[PDB]
């Protein structure tokens, strides 16, 4: 349009530069100096300029915390294959044993596909930043009648989250937090600089607080974040480890009955910021690749965790996510799953099993179509079942593996659709069998302390319903190193998780469920081949038969009833319950597996159900028969076995 | 006699659907140009629900009240209600009774009947930009934090405390004689 | 000369900037039309931030001397205080 010659005194020297416009605008298809010129307001006098200055909140000083950032993305393996996310097609990659990396450039393009306003011209912003429109993504939500809202907007270069609260007077307060590498932070309006705003500064990264003095004073009444800790963690954690940290907190918060009635305290508000960061960190890590490629395994881990985070927050708070979802990677993951047998995943190296599970989660988003992944998860659980030692509280590794697989299971349980009932039922049965008293103990400890043993537990998806506070406490850890109040609280948390009022406890995937007249009287459900057994305290159930177990005078009734082929009868069988025949003429040593497919349980005459097991293989049968499980010296404990013939037998002894 | 049984197996499932490689980015992500979301809070003004007011007679069921002090009976409505809900909830529950705001004298009495977990809705409200009052009139000290008319008390409350949400469910403080 | 601040972008043909020493800390810019020349007294602080933003926004399209300019402008900008104006006579050049 009109080239401008600019002259400027540089240490006494009257130097000048020429400023072309179209030569650059032609190269930068979104830059319009005219609009910025209007915003520049070069006609602004000193008074109004200073008025803006006095309005904006100033940070007292900067923490100056030194730290080092880890390397999330590893060097490209020599034998890896190169994947172009924009050119994904049926060939090039087949099998899970082939290393590969996906080019960052097209990945970034997909993750930040959407374009819009990053920095709006509103009351707290128009006085700080110049208008910015660019490729971006965001996480956002609103709570408390939408009196309070938060937007976790971010770019591939920097993050900026906004906290907004509106009073009943219509008055509002707004505070924003800017985070990213110092060298590439968004342009400030007028004579302002980041060193006056920055609260934390590291080698590359800094955290900047953007608000007004009046609003700041308001926020501080309830929202007082630990900037030191938050800032450091935001840099020193890896994308995967960071996301896991965030997720665990969210899960524990929700599970204890948190976001049911959201509280506008620091804890929750801080959490929102951390969630926003988790998404940024991944997108950032991709941008920070020098236009190279990223190992698929790394991507699987990073996206898996965000995917889960998305699914959970979208329920707990009802938050939504826009962007950070690459169709290219999803298609590739789906392709990989299509080259393997779901049923046989349990026979793969543990390392590969996790890989496959993560890929599956991403490849088939929201488990909306390919339900076959459930069979996959079951294969994995079953193989684990056959390796896991009797009644032991799993293992760190097992927990991680199962945790990953459990996600697709949880997705299926959100819809009352009877797809692969039999597989889902098995999954729950196996999970139930693994939920020993030791597991309850280990979990409660983990909950009290906030460890991975509280985060994930197969018990959560079990078909055991007779658990209450008193029982869980009796099974609680007995250590002087624990806060006994915290433990009792952990119990309430645990009970909450299993509440019948919780969506994933509905268990409507089980046809037999219909036979239940009183859910509140159900003690346990055991779905076996050609028969589901219901254990309850209610005489009335639409079963094919009815048995009553021996117990003490003051004990709750113990009713057992099979449902043949999961078909409900017209009502309870008239007359008194049957008794169970006893077996004494049986040896501990057996030629082969004769109980495979059968269930084995035991109970205390006073306390009720104590253990559950399920015979899946010879090794399992051997382990149990060779163990001292069958304590025939304990006259208060009885052992029952349930067959696929819809019958039950009691064990009197073993040679 | 017993018969050997086969190992437990997972039920076979269908093969995965094919990948639609003909779905373009435009289809994967429609409407490339987007705008950040916003919400508009619903605002309304609280006014005294003149349908109900301070009861004007004596009454007390000696086995229904939670605690007593001086000449009054104090109740904690068991059913959990919203702050607004308390006004009607008590009026429609007992003979002469009403939603009551704790005094500097009485508040200590009720706080000693509360644990550190529960939170009790109280009959204290803003009239104008201030002059926090109750059905008994008078002026109350309120811990003004949030721009809302509702207040509550708890074990560690020295005054009625403001709160960001009135829609949460809590026991109601009401009295009789 | 120093002036008191109190117009389409395309209407400017030349821009003149000065040091902090010239106008006793008051960062001022002089704008002018293209003969026939009409000058305008402009807020130097705003003018500088304007150009810095443009150069960063178009960083991918800059040439050697433009990157040098960016550094120069940022340097000058960083060296220009604001707070000192609380003591200065804001109408000094009025």
């Amino acid at each position: 349009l009109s080239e401008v010659k600019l002259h400027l005194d540089i240490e006494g020297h009257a130097s000048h530069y020429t400023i072309p416009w179209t030569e650059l605008m032609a190269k930068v298809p979104g830059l319009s100096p005219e609009a910025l010129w209007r915003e520049a307001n070069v006609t602004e006098d000193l008074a109004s300029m200073l008025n803006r200055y006095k309005l904006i909140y100033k940070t007292s000083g900067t923490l100056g915390i030194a730290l080092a950032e880890p390397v999330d993305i590893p060097a490209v393996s020599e034998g890896s294959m190169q994947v172009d996310a924009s050119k994904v097609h049926p060939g090039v990659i087949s099998g899970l044993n082939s290393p590969a990396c996906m080019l960052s450039a097209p990945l970034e393009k997909q993750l930040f596909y959407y374009i819009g306003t990053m920095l709006p011209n509103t009351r707290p912003h128009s006085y700080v930043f110049y208008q910015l429109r660019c490729h971006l993504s965001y996480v956002a939500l609103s709570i408390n009648g939408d009196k309070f809202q938060y937007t976790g907007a971010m770019t591939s270069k920097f993050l900026m989250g906004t906290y907004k609260r509106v009073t009943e007077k219509g008055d509002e307060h707004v505070l924003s937090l800017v985070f990213g590498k110092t060298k590439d932070l968004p342009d400030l309006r007028g004579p302002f600089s980041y060193p006056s705003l920055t609260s934390a500064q590291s080698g590359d990264y800094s955290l900047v607080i953007v608000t007004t003095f009046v609003h700041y004073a308001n926020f501080h009444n309830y929202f007082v974040p630990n900037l030191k800790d938050m800032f450091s963690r935001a840099v020193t954690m890896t994308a995967a480890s960071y996301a896991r940290y965030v997720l665990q907190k969210l899960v524990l918060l929700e599970m204890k009955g948190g976001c049911r009635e959201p509280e506008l305290d620091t804890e929750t508000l801080t959490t929102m910021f951390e969630v926003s960061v988790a998404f940024f960190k991944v997108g950032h890590a991709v941008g920070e690749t020098g236009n190279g490629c990223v190992d698929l395994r790394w991507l699987a881990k990073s996206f898996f965790e965000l995917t889960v985070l998305k699914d959970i927050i979208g329920i707990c708070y009802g938050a939504t996510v826009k962007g950070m979802q690459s169709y290219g990677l999803e298609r590739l993951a789906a392709m990989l799953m299509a080259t393997v047998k779901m049923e046989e995943l349990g026979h793969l190296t543990t390392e590969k099993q996790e890989y496959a599970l993560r890929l599956a989660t991403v490849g088939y988003p929201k488990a909306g179509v390919y339900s076959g992944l459930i069979g996959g998860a079951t294969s994995v659980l079953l193989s684990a079942y056959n390796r896991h030692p009797l009644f032991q509280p799993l293992h760190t590794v097992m927990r991680e593996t199962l945790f990953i697989g459990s996600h697709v299971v949880l997705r299926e349980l959100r819809l009352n659709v009877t797809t692969q009932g039999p597989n889902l039922a098995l999954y729950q049965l196996l999970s139930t069998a693994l939920c020993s008293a030791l597991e309850i103990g280990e979990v409660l400890r983990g909950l009290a302390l906030g460890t991975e043993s509280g985060l994930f537990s197969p018990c959560y998806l079990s078909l055991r319903f007779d658990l209450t506070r008193d029982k869980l406490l009796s099974m609680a850890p007995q250590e002087a190193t624990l806060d006994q109040a915290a433990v009792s609280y952990a119990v309430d948390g645990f009970l909450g998780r299993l509440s019948l009022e919780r969506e994933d406890r509905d268990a409507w995937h089980l046809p037999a469920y219909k036979c239940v007249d009183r859910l509140d009287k159900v003690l346990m459900i055991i779905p076996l081949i050609n028969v589901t057994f219901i254990i309850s305290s209610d005489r009335e159930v639409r079963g094919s038969a009815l048995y009553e177990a021996s117990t003490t005078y003051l004990s709750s009734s113990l009713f057992l009833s099979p449902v043949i082929m999961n078909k409900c009868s017209q009502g309870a069988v008239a007359g008194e319950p049957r008794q169970i025949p006893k077996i004494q003429n049986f040896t501990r040593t057996q030629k082969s597996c004769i109980f495979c497919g059968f269930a084995l349980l035991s109970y205390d005459e006073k306390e009720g159900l104590e253990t559950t097991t399920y015979i899946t293989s010879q090794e399992v049968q051997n382990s149990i028969l060779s163990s001292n499980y069958f304590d025939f010296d304990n006259l208060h404990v009885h052992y029952l076995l349930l067959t696929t013939n819809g019958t039950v037998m009691e064990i009197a002894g073993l040679y | 006699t017993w018969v050997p049984k086969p190992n437990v197996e997972v039920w076979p499932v269908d093969p995965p659907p094919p990948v639609n490689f003909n779905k373009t980015a435009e289809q994967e992500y429609g409407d490339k140009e987007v705008k950040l979301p916003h919400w508009t809070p619903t605002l309304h003004t609280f006014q005294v629900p003149q349908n109900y007011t301070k009861a004007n007679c004596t009454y007390c069921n000696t086995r229904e009240y939670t605690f007593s002090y001086k000449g009054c009976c104090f109740y904690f409505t068991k059913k959990k209600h919203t702050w607004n809900g308390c006004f009607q909830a008590c009026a429609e529950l007992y003979p002469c009774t009403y939603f009551y705001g704790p005094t500097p004298d009485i508040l200590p009495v009720v706080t000693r009947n509360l644990n550190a977990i529960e939170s009790l809705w109280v009959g204290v409200y803003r009239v104008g930009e201030g002059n926090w009052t109750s059905l008994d009139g008078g002026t109350f000290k309120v811990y003004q934090i949030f721009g809302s008319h509702c207040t509550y008390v708890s074990k560690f409350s020295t005054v009625p405390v403001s709160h960001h949400e009135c829609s949460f469910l809590k026991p109601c403080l009401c009295v009789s004689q | 000369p120093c002036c008191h601040v109190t117009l389409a972008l395309e209407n400017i043909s030349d821009i003149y900037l000065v040091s902090n020493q010239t106008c006793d800390g008051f960062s001022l810019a002089s704008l002018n039309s293209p003969q026939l020349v009409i000058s305008r007294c402009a807020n130097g602080l705003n003018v500088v931030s304007f150009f810095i933003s443009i150069l960063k926004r178009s960083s991918s399209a800059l040439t050697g001397h433009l990157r040098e300019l960016l550094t120069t402008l940022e340097t000058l900008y960083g060296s220009f205080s604001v707070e000192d104006l609380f003591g200065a006579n804001l109408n000094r050049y009025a």
Partner: antibody
Amino acid sequence: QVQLVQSGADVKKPGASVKVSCKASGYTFIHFGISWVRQAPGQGLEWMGWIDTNNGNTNYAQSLQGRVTMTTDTSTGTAYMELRSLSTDDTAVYFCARALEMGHRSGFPFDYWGQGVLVTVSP
Amino acid sequence: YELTQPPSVSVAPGQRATITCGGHNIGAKNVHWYQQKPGQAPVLVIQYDSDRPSGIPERFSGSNSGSTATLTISRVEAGDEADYYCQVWDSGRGHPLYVFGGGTKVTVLG
């Protein structure tokens, strides 16, 4: 609510020393700083100093520096301020106030004030 | 930085009682106003140039520009008789402090 309770009021003589105690209540002590101000009878308000209740950072009036000390007891939420080498001209009412923040390039107003204490100095 | 305030003022009831404070570039600073009655601690009424907290009647206002800051009480009442002070924050050239002006005694006739 927000409360500040002040005590330690007394009558001293020139050369003596006094320590004023201000007790916080109703809020997290460490979340807000504390300001001190003096007011002699018939006079205006003289800023004395400010203390960071969390970090121990202090800012003193130049006219007091060398004869003034501030400190807090975190576990009780109690602030203390000591004056030394007292003079008759130091007869005044002393106040504490809740001071959110202060620093080299910023500071807030004082929303809440304590009752104050009267300190008299006379030979 | 020393602030300038008048000794005292006394006005008719119901009038737009107006109090001013002088200072170099005072408009560039955040001015706070405090009210004090005998036997009582000073109370913040207006902060940051016309921002008022809850508890302050809507008849209280004010502003700040150039060399003059101002506070105004609409329909001044006898109960508004009190001393008022202007306060600013000062960077102190490395020794940051707060400064109060002389203060003004404000009364109402009747």
